[PDB]
Write a protein that binds this ligand. Sequence first.
Ligand SMILES: Fc1ccc(CNCc2ccccc2)cc1
Length: 460
Amino acid sequence: QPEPDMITIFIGTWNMGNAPPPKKITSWFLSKGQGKTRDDSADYIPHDIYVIGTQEDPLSEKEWLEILKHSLQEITSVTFKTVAIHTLWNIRIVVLAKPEHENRISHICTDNVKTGIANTLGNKGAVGVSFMFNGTSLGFVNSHLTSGSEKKLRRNQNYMNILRFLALGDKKLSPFNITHRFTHLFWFGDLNYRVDLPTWEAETIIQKIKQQQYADLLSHDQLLTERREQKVFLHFEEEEITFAPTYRFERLTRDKYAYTKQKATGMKYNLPSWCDRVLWKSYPLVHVVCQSYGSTSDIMTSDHSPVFATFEAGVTSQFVSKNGPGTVDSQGQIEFLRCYATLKTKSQTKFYLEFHSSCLESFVKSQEGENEEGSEGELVVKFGETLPKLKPIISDPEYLLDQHILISIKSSDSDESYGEGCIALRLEATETQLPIYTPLTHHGELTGHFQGEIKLQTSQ
Ligand SMILES: Fc1ccc(CNCc2ccccc2)cc1
């Protein structure tokens, strides 16, 4: 039986509003309702992996896993296996996979992060799951961020705390946070960003929603505006939104948005908003295609509607050769030539690089670079042709051209990373000097750039 080179992944996010679900939730897993929906001819075809994030989830793990498994079995006639389940108070992530994938999935990790201090600590935060699927690392984050139209900056803070502190994936990747540890990272949840229009416009907004005229509303969505100003989710993607706002509904219908201030809301307005979102970030030049992104119309127990997204995701096989794993393949080499980092830092330490990759036996430390002043005020760290020649464990181009090199630039004085990035080995040519580039981030914010040339030798 050949190993797959593609899988499909279902992402669901649903803020359940502390209510049990209705008896039928199959529309969710079928990507049926509003937005970019899945074709009827696919309804019996199981996704490879289902990742369900809930918020305000009132059920036990057992109660929810029985509902999920029974739902998928009814759709697909497949009994899914549980990869992982992790709950932080009423925030939960479930990962289910087809039985044939059980032997393909390993290195399963779970973690959570609680956001806030004192007053603001006790119910918001994130859960996450990571694992290997053959040669491919996958990470999944379900976050419930701070509520309220006025609190976008708090949400942005919650995002940075989650990507700093959530401990998933390979712990040897110590300079790297979750935004660099996975081939594919999916981040979803009740992100709680609102449509930032005046309160007095509530009925106008409702009118626009009834006319399915979302364009002007989306131009005021706080997550899209914060992302466009590089305040949050830097280097993540989101599919175009073509479904109505998923919050705040009167329960047991979808005919009414309940936006007016009430004692139960702390006297806050909840104008119709796209609270419930799915974003992703994949390594450069890896196949990832969103095939659905929408909301259900028939699940009405909560004041939120469920959101679905589905993806094609490229995956690679576990590779064994006669040499690696457990030695190098002297036919392979990676040379980084005429490289320089451009950093936003005002520090004057010396810097060294680390190169991390599952195509190396272990990470490689460079010599210190040569610091110069950039003509617009910046630090430029030059590495010349001084960089260590990297020795991959396998030289076969069918393996090596699918790999990635993570780069950290670290202070000699403190050994702290000032920036992290990723270079694809999916080159136009081997044995040929070719331009490379990555932005560098630290704690998910832009700190610089790395650019230069690469020369890749494979067994071909
Ligand atoms: F649904 C799932 C439940 C459990 C798992 C864990 N499988 C680990 C494994 C891999 C290879 C051989 C033996 C064990 C993976 C998926």
